[model samples]
Structure formats: structure tokens, C-alpha cells
Target: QDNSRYTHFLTQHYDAKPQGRDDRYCESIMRRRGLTSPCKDINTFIHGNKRSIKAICENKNGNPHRENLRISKSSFQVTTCKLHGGSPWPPCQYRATAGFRNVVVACENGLPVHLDQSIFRR
Candidate 1:
């Protein structure tokens, strides 16, 4: 679990940068999980978030755009998407009809060891 070390941070923190914030946050989590050289920003962990909930992970991009969005610990257990605004889901109709629930990230060797549902739900 990516939030294993910082579960409290995600559950209680007053900000939305779960992957950014202080480097120690990611480093500590990675270290505890045997990951190395983790990143400190969503850019490195997420790409093409210009129009999705992934954008909601940052204060500068989130709707409230306040200091913190006050996310909960349960948030880590699910995915995050911008469907609350009536935005259309990405064109994965083919995958859906093919029996695939959704796209998934595969950890090959190294690539920011973190659990992010920023691409899946509202």
C-alpha cells in the first residue's frame, strides 16, 4: 500500500498534495516500502492530468483551490476522477465492452512508488 507509512498524513493533513508537499512524505513512504528515489510532485507520478481529478490533487488546480481540501483516509482505497462535475469519462468504451474494468498501472522496475486513485473516481 502506498499510504502505509503516511496513512495519517493523507487522513489528517490539511492539503491536497499527497505526492508533493514535503519530500520527506514520499521519501518516508518509499523507504518504508523498500522503494528508492521517489518523486515529490504529481507531474512525475501523473501525466495528462490537465483535465481530470488528478488535477484535484493540488491546491493550485483543485476547485476549492484553498490551502487544503481535507481528504479522507478511505480516499486511498479507491480511485479519483473528475466525474462530480458531469465530465465525460475517458473514451475507454472498447476496454469496458471487452470486459476490462479499467486501465491499471504496472510497476516494472522503478517509477514513483505510490498508490494513486487520482485516475479512477470522483
Candidate 2:
């Protein structure tokens, strides 16, 4: 039930998309977003309403790694903003966002929720 880690994960993975065409977007956003080292090649951000996003976790068909666990959706605001093969540092990387979409999150007792990275990591 830690909100800070959940917020960090969401900001790093979801809200980190760059808004401007600044060439240094990758360099700055990567560091600011806490995606250190080689960086992530890809990421996703859910821009939709929180209700629908939370509903995804409410689905009975959704699987859980821990019993008695619950799920919910939260929001993060990335102020700035992946990876490349043999690419130099700060490669011009960017990501996308979706509005009014379902975002799957992992939760416990409906707290400490964060995006379901396992599903996306695969």
C-alpha cells in the first residue's frame, strides 16, 4: 500500500511521454522520469477517465497473483519525456497515450495500485 512507488511507476511508465518537439526531450525526460541507464524501449500512458480504467481491475475474469487482492486506477502527470539498438544516449524517443481507454492495474485491498507491467512486459 505504497503510493509513492505506485506514483513513480506510473509516471515512469505512463505519463512520461514528451509533449514538445525539443530534441533533448529524451535526455531530459528519461532522467527526470527516473528511467535511468539504457532506458525503456517502449511505454504506455492511459489518458482516459479513471472510472473506466478502474473498471478494468473490477472485471471478474482478470487474474490475480495474490489472493484477496484488489485493483484500481490512478493518474499521474508527466511534465516531460525509450530505448534503441546500439543507439547513443538520449536517442530521440517518444511514446503514445490513449483517451477513454481501459488501463489494467495491479492492486491489493484496492491500494498501492500501479499499471500491470507483467502483462505489458511480456
Top candidate (TM-score) = 2
Query: What does the lDDT come to for candidate 1?
Result: 0.27
lDDT by residue (1-122, candidate 1, tens digit) is 45433433232212233443233443343334332322222211222222232324433333331242322111222212121122233221110000112222222122112233443332
Candidate 2 lDDT: 0.46
Q: For each candidate, give its TM-score against the true structure.
A: 0.19, 0.47
Residue-level lDDT of model 2, residues 57-77, one tens digit each, is: 555424454554433333333
* Model 1 / residue 115 / CA error / Å: 6.0
RMSD of each: 17.0, 6.2
In model 2, pairs of residues that clash are: 41-83, 48-100
Worst 10 residues of 1 by lDDT: 91-100
Model 2 regions more than 4 Å off:
14-28, 48-82, 87-92, 95-101, 117-122
